[PDB]
Ligand binder design. Structure first.
Ligand SMILES: CCCCCCCCCCCCCCCCCC(=O)OC[C@H](COP(=O)([O-])OCC(O)COP(=O)([O-])OC[C@@H](COC(=O)CCCCCCCCCCCCCCCCC)OC(=O)CCCCCCCCCCCCCCCCC)OC(=O)CCCCCCCCCCCCCCCCC
Ligand SMILES: CCCCCCCCCCCCCCCCC[C@@H](O)O[C@H](CO[C@H](O)CCCCCCCCCCCCCCC)COP(=O)(O)OCC[N+](C)(C)C
Ligand SMILES: CCCCCCCC/C=C\CCCCCCCC(=O)OC[C@H](COP(=O)(O)OCCN)OC(=O)CCCCCCC/C=C\CCCCCCCC
Ligand SMILES: CCCCCCCC/C=C\CCCCCCCC(=O)O[C@H](COC(=O)CCCCCCC/C=C/CCCCCCCC)COP(=O)(O)OCCN
Ligand SMILES: CCCCCCCCCCCC(=O)SCCNC(=O)CCNC(=O)[C@H](O)C(C)(C)COP(=O)(O)O
Lengths: 70, 88, 63, 84, 128, 55, 178, 124, 104, 219, 175, 459
C-alpha cells in the first residue's frame, strides 16, 4: 500500500517527505491549538473570580457585636 | 514484518563483518575456516564474547551447550542457517 | 458503486425493517417505547395547546 | 512483491572510535591499563543519521515555531477583521 | 557481605547456590554417570520406538500408566487407619458440615425471630 | 416518526451482519477485514445522528 | 539443544556460564552502549585477576562466592530475547506447526492439488523405508554392551547409509511454518 | 488548608466542625434578617428538571443557560454571557458560604473570649 | 516443572517431560500452567513481610485519613424550598417545619 | 470504600509502572492507574465527570497502544525498551503521535485529557473526603507524568540500540490514517465534547490560586 | 393507538415545546429528520398500507374466553373431590389474574419512572403508593405458601391471619 | 400417551426383523420419528395436567423429561455405531433392544399416575442399564462398578417401597392427584421422621447426594458411551423428579429435616468442584461435574420455593444435554487415543479444529454462560437460596468460580498447547461425530429462546 523502502544495515533508514511533513504539520496544529485556546480561554487555567480574603471582611457584615451586647 | 529471507551468503557476510570489527583478530589473516584458539590464539572468554556479539548481531541467543563448541566461522554460519532454516 | 450497493444492502434494509418493527409491532403494545418528557423552559409554546408559558419574574440583572 | 534488491554490506573500515563517546571509555580504560576490543563494532550507532540527538524539552517543542507563527497570523487576521 | 538467600517451599534454592554442587566426590560423579546412563537407555528406547516407519499408533508409556494407577486405583489398598489419618478424615469430613450448619441455623433463627416479632420491612418481597 | 430509537437499534443490528456473513464465501477471501472495517465505519456514521439529536 | 548433554559440568564450563550470565545482566543494568562496554571491560578485568589460580580447592571457592554475588544483583527483570524461553514471542508460532504425517490423511481431491510435492513425498518415504532398516542394524552393532551411556548418536559410516534416527530431525515443520 | 492544620494541631473547640454548622441562631447577628430570594417557582423549576443538586438558589441562570443552548444548538458556543452569569452567581453563593464559615468562627471566638473573661472574673 | 531445563530436547517440550522417567506424584499441580516453585530474586520471607507491611500501612493510613478528613472553609450548601422537601421524598400532606436560610 | 480502592489502585499501579521495561506493561499499568482515578471520581460522587474521563481516556490510551504496536512491528517484534534507541528521527510520525498522546495523558492544558483530569483534580481537592486518598491521587498524577517521561526518554531520545539490520518503515496508508484519526480525536474531541454537552454538575467557579494550579505544578 | 385501553395504561398529555430557532444557522437535526422521513417512512408506510389492504380482504375474529363462577373452597365438603377440584382450578385462575394485575401496576410504575426524567422522585408518588398497596395485598394473599401451594393452604393462612386480627382487636377494644 | 409408548414397543420387532446391515438406519430414523411425535407433549397448559387415562398423565415437569428421553436414543445409537462395528448381528440387536427397553421404562416412569407403578418402573430401569454396563464395558472394573450401581440404588429404595405401601394403608390411595388434593401435614414425631427418611433417601442416592456418590464415577467411567449418555442425561433426573413429586406429603417436617441434606449438598458442590481441578481422567472429571450440578439441584428441591422448582427443572434439562455432549466428545477423543487420559492427548486444535470448536461450545455451556438455560437454572436456584439465607450465596459464588476453572482447564489441557509427537493415528473427525455434536448443541441454543418450555409447572 506504500512505497518500496530498502533495509540499511547500520545506516539511517529511508524517509519519505510525506511522513516528515505530516508529522511536522500535526505537531504544528497541536501547538497552534494549545496557543489559540490559551489566548481565547485563559480563565480555564488561572480562574476568573478572585479568591476572597476572610480576614479582610469587617465585623459589620459578619454580624459581630463588640463582646458586650451579648 | 516485511523481513527479507536472509541467505547463506548474507549470514556468512554478517559473521565475517562482526569478526572483523573485533580488533583482537587480524582482519587480513582471518578466514571462514579459521579456528579460534589455534589459528587465532584466542581464549575461552574471548570465544564467549564473540558468541554474545553474534547473538546481539542476529537477534537470537544460542544455548551455552551449543555455544561452547562453535569454534569456526563456517560452523557458526551453518548453525545459524540450520536454526533459521535457510535454503541456499 | 461498491459503497452504493453496500449502503443499500447493509444500512437501508435494516433501517426499513427496524422502522416497520418498531412503528407497527413494538408500539402496538403499551409502554414498550417510553420517552423522557422534553424539557420545559419559561417562554416556550406547547404545540398541542398553543398557550404561552409565563416568563420569569424579571430578576435583577447586574453583571 | 517483496524487498529483494541484493543489499550489500558497507565497508567495515569506516567505523571509527573518533567523534564518539567511546573515546572517553577508551581513555578511562587506558588510564587503568585496559582496552575495549569491541569499540568499533558499535560505532555505527554514533556515525550516520544517529549522530545528532534532541533533548526532552526539544522533543516536546517539536512544532513550536510553525504553531506560533500560525497563532500570530491568526490573531492578527482576527484583529484586522474585527475592527470594522 | 551480601544478604543471604533463604529458600522456601514455593521459592526453592538455585542450582548455583547449592552447597552440594561443589563438595564433589567420585561417588557423586559415579551417581551422575549412572543417571545419565539410564536416561540415555530410556531415550534410545523411545527413539527406536519413535522413528519406526511401521508404527501407526501411540507409544505406550509405562510411567504414565503407573502414575495414573498410583493416583487412582492404589490409594485404598495401601490405606491404614492411623491416628493422623483418622483425625484428618474426621476434621475434613465433619467440621465444615457442622460449621456451616451452625452458621445457617443461627442466621435462619434470627430471621424467623424477626419475622415473629415483626420489624424486618418485608415490603416488595413478592417473589421468593 | 421517532428516528431516534430506529437509528439506535440499527447501529447495533448492522454491527451484527458480518457475524452472519462469516459462514458465507466472503469469509474465505481476503476482503473480510476490509468488509468488517467498512461495516464499523458505517455504523459509527449512522450512530452519529442520535448523538446530534440528544445534543 | 542440538548437542547432547554430559553427565556433569566441569569448572571451565561453570566459569564460562557465570561469565555469560554476568555480562547479560550487566548489559541489562547498563542500558547504554558506552556504559555497558566500560563496565563489561572492567568486569572482565576483575574476572581475569584470578585466571592463573592453580589449586582447585581455592578456584572453586572463588566461583562459589561469585555465585552468591551475582544472585544479589541479578536485575530481577533481565533482558530476554523475544524467541528465548522467557521472551514475549517464545512459542508464538507453536500452534502452526503441523506434523508431516498429517498429509497422509488428506483427501484425494486435496492431493490432486500439488502433485509434484506429493511425488517427492513418496520418494522421501521410500528413502526412509530402506534407511531405517539399515539404521536399526547399524545402531544395534555400534551400541556398547549394557546400553548406551550418553544420548549421542553415531553418523553414517558407509557410502549409501544415512545417520541413524534422522527422519524426525530433518522433517522439522519450520521455524515459522505459516 | 491552613484551617485543617490549625484544627488538627491546635484546639478543636475554637474552630467549627463543618458537620454541625451552624451552631448559633441566625438572628444573633443583626435584627433586620433579610431572607434569601428565589425567582424560580416550583412548577417551572420542576419542568426544567435540572437535577436535585442543581435545584439551588442559582437556578434561574442555569435555566437561562439551558434555554440558550437549546435555542442555538448548531453553534454551541453561541451563548457565553449566560454561562458567565451562572458561574458568577455560583461564585457569589460560595462567597456567602465562606462568609457563613467565618461568621460562625468569629461568633465562637467571641463566645470563648466572653466565657474566659467571665470565668476569670468569677474566680476572683 | 517450569524450572526444568528449557534447552534440553524433551520428548514432551510443552510439559518438559521425558519418556520413561518417573512422573512426579503432583505432576498436574506443576505443569507450567499452575503453581511453580522457581527461585525468586528476593527471598520469600522478605517478599511476604514487604507485601503485608505495605498493605497494613496503606489500610492504617486510610483509616487515619478517615479520622482526619480534608475539606474547605465553607458552610453547607443551602437549598431554598424547605430543604427540597417536596422534591425529595414528597409527602405533601404533612406540612413540615419551615426552614429559612440566613442571607449574609 | 470506592474512594479508598481507587486511590490505592492508582498509586500502586503508577508505582509499578515507573520502573518497568516492557512498553506494553507500562501502558497497561497506565490504564490501570487511569481506571483507579476514575474510581476515585466515582467515590467523590461525580459520575458524569468519570464518564467524561472514560471518553477522553479511550481516545488517547488507544492511540498510545497503537503507537506502541507500530514501534514493536517496525522493530522486529521487540517490546523491551532497552533495545529501543533513536526513533525521534528514524520514524517521526509515531514519535509525534506518542508525544501528543503523552501530553494528553498528563493533562496538558487544552487537550482531550485536560478537560477531564483537571476537573477531577479540582473536584477531589474541594471535597469533604479522605485526605490520604487526596495525597495518593496527587502522587499518582506525579508518577503518571514520571513514567510518561520514562517512555519518551527510553524510546525516542538516546542512541540506537537495536540489531544492525534496520527495517524501520511507517509508509503504509492504513497505519498513518488510523493514527491520524486518533490524533485529531485526542486534540479536538475533548473541547468539542466539553462545549457541546449540557451541564450536569455544579462548577467550582472560585479557586485558590495555588490550588487551581496544583495539578499542573505536580505534573 | 386504540389497540390498548388508555385508562388502564394512562399517559400524560405529553406537552412539547415549539421550535425556537435563535439564529439563521441551519441545524443538521432537521435536515436529517426530513431525509430520514423521505427514504424510510414512505416505503414503510406504503408496505404497511399494502399489508393492511391485503388483511382487510380476509377478516375474521377471535374471542376472549369467559369463565363461569363456581363454589369456592370455603363451601366445599371435606372429602368432596369434584368440588375441591373445581375450587382449586378457580383459585389457580384467580392467582394468575392477581399476578397479571401486579404486572400491570409494575409496568405503570416503570413507565412513570422513565417518563418523568429527573423529577421522578416527586412526580411518581401516586404510582408508588398504588404499587405499595397492591404489593402489600399480594404478599398478604399468596406469599410464603411454598412450592406446593393450594386453595386449602391459602385458606388456612387467611384463617390464621383473621384469628390473629380478632385476638388483637378483642385485646385493644376491651382495653 | 399410548401413541408414543406403542411405537417404542414396536421398535423391538422392527430391530429384530431388520437386515444385518440396516439395523442402525431403521433404529435411528424411527427413534427420530418417535421424538418428533413426543414433541407434541410440550404443549402444556396452566391448568391441572394432561390426564390421558387412569394410568398415564403428563405435566409440564414430565413433558420436558419425556422429550429429552425420546431425543436421547438417536444420539446414543449414533455414538454406539462406531465401537459395535466388529460385533455380531445378534449382539448388536441385543444392545439396541436394551436401549429400547430402557427408553420404554423411562417413558412409562415419567408419566406414572400411580406411585407404585412409578417405583416398579423406576427399578425396572435398573436392569438394562446394569446389563449394558457389565456386558459391553471395555475395562475389568466394570463388574465392580455395576455392583455398586446396583446395590447403592437398591439400598436407597427398598425402604421406600415399604413406606409407599404404608401410605396406601393409611391414606388409601397412591394416585398423585388424590395425594395432592388430600395432603395432610406430618406431625413432628420419630415415626414421621423415619417415614421422611425412607421417602427421601431413595431418591437422594441416585441423584446422587454427596457421600452417596461413590457409585457414580465408577458407573460413568466403566460404562460404554451409550451407558454414560443415559446415566448422565436422564437416569440422574429420576431422583429429582421423584423428590419433586413426593415432597407434597412431607410438609412441614422438611422445614427442619432438610438441614443435613442442604449442608451436605452445599459443601459437596465445593468438594466435587475442587476434585475436578485435579483429575487424571476426563470421564471422572465429567462425572464429578455432574455430581456438583446435581447437588445444586438437590439444594433447590430442598428449598421448596417456586423459583427453586423452576431453576431445578431448567438445570436438570440443561445439565443432561451438556453432560451428554461432553461424554460424547470424551469418547470421540478416546476412540483415537485408546487411553482415556487428559495429558496424553494435547494440542488437538491444530489437528481437529471443528472438534476444538465443539469442545469450546460444550465448555462454555458447562461454564454456565448467559443467556443459556444452564445459567437460567443457576441464577434461579441462587436467588431462591439467597431468599432462604443471605449467606448461601458465598458458597454458591465459590462453586461458580471453581466450575469455570476446571471447565477451562479441561479445555486448555486437551486442546491447547503442543501436540503429542508420538501419536500419529489422529484421523480427521467423521461426519457422524460432527452431526452428533450439532444435534447435542443446537437444542440448547434453541431452548434458550423459549425458556418457559423447561421451567416446570410453577412458571
Ligand atoms: C453476537 C450475536 C450474533 C448473531 C448472528 C447470528 C449467529 C448465529 C449463531 C448460532 C449458534 C452458532 C452455532 C454453534 C456452533 C458453531 C458452528 C461452527 O462450526 O462454526 C464454524 C462456522 C464457520 O467457520 P469455519 O472456518 O468453517 O470453522 C473453523 C472452526 O470451526 C473455528 O471456529 P471459530 O474459531 O470461528 O469459533 C466458532 C465460533 C462459533 O461457535 C460458538 O461458540 C457459537 C455459540 C456461542 C454460544 C455459547 C454458549 C453460551 C450460551 C449462549 C446462547 C445464545 C443462543 C441464542 C439463540 C440462538 C438460536 C440457535 O465461536 C465463537 O465465535 C465464540 C463465541 C463466544 C461468544 C460469547 C457471547 C455469547 C452471548 C452473546 C449474546 C447472545 C444473546 C443476545 C441477546 C441480546 C442481543 C439481542 O463459524 C460460524 O458459523 C460462527 C457463527 C457466529 C458465532 C456466534 C457467536 C455468538 C452468537 C450466539 C447466538 C446468537 C444470539 C441471537 C441474537 C442475535 C441478535
Ligand atoms: C452418609 C451420607 C449421607 C446419608 C444421609 C445423612 C443424613 C441423615 C440424618 C437424618 C436427619 C437427622 C437424624 C435425627 C433428626 C431428629 C432431630 C434432632 O436432630 O434434633 C434433636 C434431637 O436430639 C437427638 O438427635 C435425639 C436422637 C439421638 C440419637 C440418634 C443418633 C444421633 C447420631 C447418629 C449418627 C449415625 C449416622 C449414620 C446412620 C447409619 C432435638 O431434640 P428434641 O427436640 O427433644 O426431639 C426432636 C424429635 N421429636 C420432636 C420427634 C421429639
Ligand atoms: C478467592 C480466590 C481463592 C483462591 C483461588 C485458588 C484457585 C486455584 C486454582 C487456580 C489454577 C492455577 C493457576 O491459575 O495458575 C497459577 C497462575 C500462574 O501465575 P502467573 O503470574 O500467570 O505465572 C506466569 C509466569 N510463569 O496464577 C493464577 O492465575 C492464579 C491466581 C489466583 C489468585 C487468588 C488470590 C486472589 C485474592 C483476592 C483478594 C481480593 C479481594 C477483593 C479485593 C477488593 C474488592 C472490593
Ligand atoms: C444408601 C443407604 C440408605 C439406606 C436407607 C436409609 C433410610 C432408612 C430409613 C428407615 C427405613 C425404614 C423406615 C420405615 C418406613 C416408614 C414407615 C413408618 O413410618 O411407620 C412407622 C414405623 O417406624 C419404624 O418402624 C422405623 C424403624 C426403623 C427400622 C429400620 C432401621 C434402619 C436403620 C435406622 C437408622 C438409619 C437412619 C439414617 C440413615 C442415613 C442414610 C444411610 C410407624 O409405625 P406404626 O407402628 O404404624 O406407628 C406407631 C404408632 N402406632
Ligand atoms: C550484575 C551482576 C554481577 C555479578 C558478579 C559476579 C561475580 C563476578 C566476579 C567473579 C570472580 C571470579 O573471577 S571467580 C574465579 C573462579 N576460579 C578460576 O577462574 C580459576 C581457574 N579458571 C579457569 O579455569 C577458567 O576456565 C579460565 C582459565 C579463566 C578460562 O579458561 P579457558 O581458557 O578454557 O577459557
Amino acid at each position: 500500500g506504500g512505497v518500496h523502502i530498502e533495509p540499511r544495515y547500520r545506516q539511517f533508514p529511508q524517509l519519505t517527505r510525506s511522513q516528515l511533513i505530516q508529522a511536522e504539520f500535526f505537531s504544528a496544529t497541536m501547538w497552534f491549538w494549545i496557543l489559540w485556546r490559551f489566548w481565547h480561554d485563559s480563565d480555564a487555567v488561572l480562574g476568573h473570580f478572585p479568591y476572597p480574603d476572610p480576614s479582610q471582611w469587617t465585623d459589620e457584615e459578619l454580624g459581630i457585636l463588640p463582646d458586650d451586647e451579648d | 514484518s516485511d523481513a527479507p529471507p536472509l541467505t547463506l551468503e548474507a549470514i556468512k557476510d554478517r559473521v565475517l563483518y562482526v569478526l572483523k570489527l573485533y580488533d583482537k583478530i587480524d582482519p587480513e589473516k582471518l578466514s571462514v575456516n579459521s579456528h579460534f584458539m589455534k589459528d587465532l590464539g584466542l581464549d575461552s572468554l574471548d570465544q564467549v564474547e564473540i558468541i554474545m556479539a553474534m547473538e546481539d548481531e542476529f537477534g537470537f541467543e544460542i544455548p551455552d551447550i551449543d555455544a561452547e563448541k562453535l569454534m569456526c566461522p563456517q560452523e557458526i554460519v551453518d548453525y545459524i542457517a540450520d536454526k533459521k532454516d535457510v535454503y541456499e | 458503486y461498491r459503497h452504493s450497493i453496500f449502503a443499500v444492502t447493509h444500512v437501508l434494509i435494516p433501517v426499513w425493517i427496524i422502522h416497520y418493527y418498531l412503528k407497527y409491532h413494538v408500539t402496538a403494545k403499551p409502554y414498550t417505547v417510553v420517552e423522557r418528557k422534553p424539557r420545559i423552559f419559561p417562554g416556550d409554546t406547547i404545540l398541542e395547546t398553543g398557550e404561552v408559558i409565563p416568563l420569569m419574574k424579571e430578576f435583577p440583572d447586574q453583571h | 512483491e517483496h524487498g529483494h534488491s541484493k543489499m550489500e554490506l558497507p565497508d567495515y573500515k569506516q567505523w571509527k572510535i573518533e567523534g564518539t563517546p567511546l573515546e572517553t571509555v577508551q581513555e578511562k580504560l587506558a588510564a587503568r591499563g585496559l582496552r575495549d576490543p569491541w569499540g568499533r563494532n558499535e560505532a555505527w550507532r554514533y556515525s550516520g543519521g544517529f549522530a545528532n540527538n534532541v533533548s526532552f524539552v526539544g522533543a516536546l517543542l517539536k512544532g513550536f515555531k510553525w504553531g506560533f507563527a500560525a497563532f500570530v497570523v491568526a490573531v492578527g487576521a482576527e484583529y484586522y477583521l474585527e475592527s470594522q | 557481605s551480601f544478604p543471604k538467600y533463604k529458600p522456601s517451599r514455593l521459592a526453592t534454592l538455585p542450582a548455583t547456590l547449592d552447597p552440594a554442587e561443589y563438595d564433589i566426590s567420585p561417588e557423586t560423579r559415579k551417581a551422575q554417570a549412572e543417571r545419565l546412563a539410564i536416561r540415555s537407555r530410556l531415550k534410545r528406547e523411545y527413539l527406536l520406538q519413535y522413528n519406526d516407519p511401521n508404527r501407526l499408533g501411540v507409544i505406550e508409556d509405562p510411567a504414565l500408566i503407573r502414575w495414573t494407577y498410583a493416583r487412582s486405583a492404589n490409594i485404598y489398598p495401601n490405606f491404614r487407619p492411623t491416628p493422623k489419618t483418622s483425625l484428618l478424615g474426621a476434621l475434613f469430613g465433619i467440621g465444615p458440615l457442622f460449621f456451616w450448619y451452625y452458621v445457617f441455623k443461627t442466621d435462619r433463627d434470627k430471621k424467623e425471630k424477626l419475622i415473629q416479632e415483626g420489624k424486618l420491612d418485608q415490603t416488595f418481597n413478592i417473589s421468593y | 416518526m421517532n428516528p431516534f430509537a430506529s437509528l439506535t437499534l440499527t447501529t447495533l443490528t448492522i454491527l451484527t451482519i458480518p457475524i452472519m456473513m462469516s459462514n458465507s464465501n466472503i469469509y474465505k477471501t481476503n476482503l473480510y477485514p476490509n468488509y468488517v472495517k467498512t461495516t464499523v465505519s458505517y455504523a459509527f456514521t449512522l450512530s452519529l445522528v442520535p448523538l446530534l439529536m440528544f445534543m | 539443544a542440538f548437542s547432547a548433554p554430559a553427565a556433569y559440568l566441569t569448572h571451565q564450563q561453570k566459569v564460562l556460564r557465570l561469565y555469560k550470565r554476568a555480562l547479560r545482566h550487566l548489559e541489562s543494568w547498563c542500558v547504554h552502549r558506552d556504559k555497558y562496554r566500560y563496565f563489561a571491560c572492567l568486569m572482565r578485568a576483575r574476572f581475569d585477576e584470578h585466571k592463573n589460580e592453580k589449586d582447585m580447592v581455592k578456584a572453586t571457592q572463588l566461583l562459589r562466592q561469585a555465585e552468591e554475588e551475582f544472585w544479589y544483583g541479578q536485575h530481577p527483570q533481565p533482558y530476554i530475547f523475544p524467541e528465548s524461553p522467557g521472551g514475549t514471542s517464545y512459542e508464538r508460532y507453536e500452534c502452526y506447526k503441523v506434523p508431516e504425517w498429517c498429509l497422509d490423511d488428506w483427501h484425494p481431491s486435496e492431493k490432486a492439488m500439488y502433485p509434484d510435492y506429493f511425488a517427492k513425498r513418496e520418494q522421501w518415504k521410500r528413502l526412509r523405508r530402506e534407511s531405517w532398516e539399515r539404521e536399526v542394524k547399524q545402531l544395534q552393532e555400534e551400541t556398547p554392551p549394557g546400553g548406551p551411556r550418553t544420548e549421542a548418536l553415531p553418523p553414517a559410516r558407509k557410502e549409501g547409509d544415512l545417520p541413524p534416527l534422522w527422519w524426525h530431525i530433518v522433517t522439522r515443520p519450520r521455524e515459522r511454518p505459516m | 488548608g491552613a484551617h485543617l492544620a490549625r484544627r488538627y494541631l491546635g484546639d478543636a473547640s475554637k474552630e467549627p466542625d463543618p458537620l454541625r454548622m451552624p451552631t448559633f441562631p441566625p438572628d444573633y447577628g443583626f435584627p433586620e434578617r433579610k431572607e434569601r430570594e428565589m425567582v424560580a417557582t416550583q412548577q417551572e423549576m420542576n419542568d426544567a428538571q435540572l437535577m436535585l443538586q442543581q435545584r439551588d438558589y442559582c437556578a434561574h441562570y442555569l435555566i437561562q443557560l439551558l434555554k440558550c443552548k437549546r435555542d442555538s444548538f448548531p453553534n454551541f458556543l453561541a451563548c457565553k454571557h449566560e454561562q458567565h452569569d451562572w458561574d458568577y452567581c455560583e461564585h457569589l453563593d460560595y462567597v456567602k458560604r465562606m462568609k457563613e464559615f467565618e461568621r460562625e468562627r468569629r461568633l465562637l471566638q467571641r463566645k470563648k473570649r466572653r466565657e474566659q473573661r467571665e470565668a476569670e472574673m468569677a474566680r476572683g | 516443572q517450569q524450572e526444568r531445563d528449557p534447552w534440553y530436547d524433551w520428548d514432551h517440550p510443552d510439559l518438559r517431560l521425558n519418556w520413561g522417567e518417573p512422573i512426579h506424584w503432583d505432576l498436574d499441580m506443576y505443569i507450567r500452567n499452575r503453581v511453580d516453585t522457581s527461585p525468586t530474586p528476593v527471598s520469600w520471607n522478605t517478599m511476604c513481610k514487604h507485601l503485608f507491611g505495605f498493605v497494613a500501612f496503606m489500610l492504617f493510613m486510610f483509616w487515619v485519613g478517615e479520622i482526619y478528613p480534608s475539606y474547605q472553609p465553607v458552610g453547607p450548601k443551602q437549598y431554598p424550598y424547605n430543604d427540597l422537601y417536596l422534591e425529595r421524598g414528597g409527602d405533601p400532606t404533612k406540612e413540615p417545619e419551615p426552614v429559612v436560610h440566613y442571607e449574609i | 470504600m470506592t474512594l479508598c480502592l481507587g486511590a490505592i489502585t492508582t498509586l500502586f499501579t503508577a508505582l509499578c509502572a515507573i520502573t518497568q521495561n516492557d512498553i506494553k506493561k507500562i501502558v497497561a499499568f497506565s490504564t490501570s492507574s487511569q481506571l483507579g482515578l476514575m474510581m476515585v471520581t466515582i467515590g467523590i460522587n461525580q459520575p458524569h465527570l468519570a464518564f467524561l474521563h472514560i471518553c477522553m481516556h479511550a481516545f488517547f490510551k488507544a492511540m498510545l497502544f497503537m503507537c506502541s504496536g507500530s514501534i514493536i512491528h517496525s522493530l522486529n517484534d521487540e517490546q523491551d525498551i532497552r533495545k529501543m534507541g533513536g526513533l525521534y528521527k528514524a520514524m517521526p510520525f509515531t514519535t509525534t503521535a506518542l508525544i501528543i498522546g503523552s501530553l494528553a495523558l498528563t493533562g496538558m492544558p487544552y487537550l482531550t485529557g485536560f478537560y477531564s483530569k483537571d476537573l477531577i483534580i479540582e473536584a477531589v481537592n474541594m471535597s469533604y473526603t479522605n485526605a490520604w486518598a487526596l495525597l495518593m491521587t496527587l502522587i499518582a498524577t506525579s508518577l503518571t507524568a514520571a513514567y510518561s517521561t520514562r517512555i519518551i526518554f527510553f524510546a525516542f531520545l538516546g542512541k540506537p540500540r537495536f540489531p544492525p539490520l534496520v527495517l524501520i518503515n511507517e509508509n503504509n496508508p492504513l497505519l498513518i490514517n488510523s493514527i491520524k484519526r486518533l490524533l485529531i480525536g485526542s486534540i479536538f474531541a475533548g473541547f468539542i465534547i466539553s462545549n457541546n454537552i449540557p451541564p450536569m454538575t455544579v462548577p467550582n467557579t472560585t479557586m485558590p490560586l495555588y490550588m487551581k494550579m496544583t495539578a499542573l505544578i505536580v505534573t | 393507538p386504540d389497540s390498548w385501553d388508555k385508562d388502564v395504561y394512562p399517559e400524560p398529555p405529553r406537552r412539547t415545546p415549539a421550535p425556537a430557532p435563535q439564529t439563521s444557522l441551519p441545524n443538521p437535526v432537521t435536515y436529517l429528520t426530513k431525509i430520514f422521513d423521505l427514504l424510510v417512512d414512505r416505503p414503510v408506510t406504503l408496505a404497511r398500507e399494502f399489508i393492511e389492504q391485503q388483511h382487510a380482504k380476509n377478516r375474521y375474529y377471535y374471542y376472549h374466553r369467559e369463565f363461569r363462577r363456581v363454589p369456592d373452597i370455603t363451601e366445599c365438603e371435606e372429602k368432596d373431590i369434584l368440588c375441591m377440584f373445581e375450587a382449586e382450578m378457580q383459585w389457580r385462575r384467580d392467582y394468575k389474574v392477581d399476578q397479571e394485575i401486579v404486572n400491570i401496576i409494575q409496568e405503570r410504575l416503570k413507565a412513570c419512572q422513565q417518563r418523568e426524567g429527573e423529577s421522578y422522585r416527586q412526580n411518581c408518588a401516586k404510582e408508588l403508593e398504588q404499587f405499595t398497596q397492591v404489593s402489600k395485598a399480594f404478599q398478604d394473599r399468596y406469599s410464603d405458601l411454598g412450592a406446593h401451594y393450594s386453595a386449602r393452604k391459602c385458606l388456612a393462612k387467611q384463617k390464621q391471619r383473621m384469628l390473629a386480627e380478632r385476638k388483637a382487636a378483642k385485646e385493644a377494644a376491651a382495653a | 400417551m399410548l401413541k408414543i409408548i406403542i411405537p417404542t414397543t414396536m421398535l423391538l420387532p422392527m430391530t429384530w426383523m431388520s437386515k444385518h446391515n440396516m439395523i442402525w438406519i431403521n433404529a435411528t430414523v424411527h427413534s427420530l420419528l418417535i421424538s418428533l411425535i413426543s414433541l407434541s407433549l410440550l404443549n402444556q397448559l396452566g391448568e391441572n395436567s394432561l390426564n390421558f387415562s387412569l394410568t398415564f398423565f403428563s405435566d409440564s415437569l414430565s413433558a420436558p423429561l419425556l422429550v429429552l428421553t425420546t431425543w436421547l436414543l438417536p444420539l446414543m445409537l449414533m455414538a454406539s455405531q462406531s465401537h459395535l462395528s466388529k460385533e455380531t448381528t445378534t449382539r448388536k440387536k441385543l444392545y439396541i433392544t436394551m436401549l429400547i427397553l430402557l427408553q420404554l421404562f423411562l417413558i412409562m416412569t415419567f408419566t406414572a399416575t400411580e406411585l407404585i407403578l412409578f417405583y416398579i418402573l423406576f427399578e425396572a430401569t435398573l436392569v438394562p442399564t446394569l446389563i449394558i454396563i457389565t456386558r459391553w464395558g471395555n475395562q475389568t472394573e466394570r463388574l465392580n462398578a455395576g455392583l455398586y450401581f446396583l446395590f447403592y440404588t437398591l439400598a436407597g429404595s427398598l425402604p421406600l417401597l415399604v413406606a409407599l405401601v404404608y401410605i396406601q394403608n393409611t391414606t388409601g390411595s397412591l394416585n398423585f392427584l388424590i395425594i395432592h388434593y388430600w395432603s395432610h401435614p406430618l406431625s413432628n414425631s420419630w415415626s414421621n421422621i423415619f417415614m421422611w427418611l425412607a421417602c427421601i433417601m431413595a431418591f437422594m442416592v441416585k441423584m446422587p447426594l454427596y457421600g452417596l456418590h461413590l457409585w457414580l464415577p465408577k458407573a460413568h467411567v466403566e460404562a460404554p458411551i451409550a451407558g454414560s449418555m443415559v446415566l448422565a442425561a436422564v437416569l440422574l433426573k429420576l431422583g429429582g423428579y421423584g423428590m419433586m413429586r413426593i415432597t407434597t406429603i412431607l410438609n412441614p417436617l422438611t422445614n427442619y429435616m432438610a438441614y443435613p441434606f442442604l449442608m451436605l449438598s452445599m459443601w459437596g458442590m465445593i468438594m466435587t468442584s475442587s476434585i475436578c481441578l485435579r483429575q487424571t481422567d476426563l470421564k471422572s472429571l465429567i462425572a464429578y461435574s455432574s455430581v456438583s450440578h446435581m447437588a445444586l439441584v438437590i439444594v433447590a428441591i430442598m428449598i421448596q420455593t417456586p423459583w427453586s422448582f423452576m431453576g431445578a427443572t431448567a438445570l436438570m434439562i440443561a445439565h443432561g444435554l451438556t453432560s451428554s455432549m461432553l461424554f460424547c466428545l470424551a469418547n470421540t477423543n478416546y476412540e483415537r487415543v485408546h487411553s482415556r487420559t487428559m495429558i496424553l492427548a494435547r494440542g488437538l486444535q491444530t489437528l481437529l479444529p471443528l472438534m476444538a470448536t465443539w469442545w469450546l461450545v460444550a465448555s462454555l455451556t458447562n461454564l454456565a454462560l448467559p443467556p443459556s438455560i444452564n445459567l437460567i437454572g443457576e441464577l434461579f436456584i441462587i436467588t431462591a437460596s439467597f431468599s432462604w439465607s443471605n449467606i448461601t450465596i458465598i458458597l454458591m459464588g465459590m462453586n461458580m468460580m471453581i466450575t469455570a476453572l476446571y471447565s477451562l482447564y479441561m479445555l486448555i489441557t486437551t486442546q491447547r498447547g503442543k501436540y503429542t509427537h508420538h501419536i500419529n493415528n489422529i484421523k480427521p473427525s467423521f461426519t457422524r461425530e460432527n452431526a452428533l455434536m450439532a444435534l447435542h448443541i443446537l437444542p440448547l441454543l434453541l431452548l434458550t429462546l423459549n425458556p418457559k418450555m423447561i421451567l416446570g409447572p410453577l412458571y
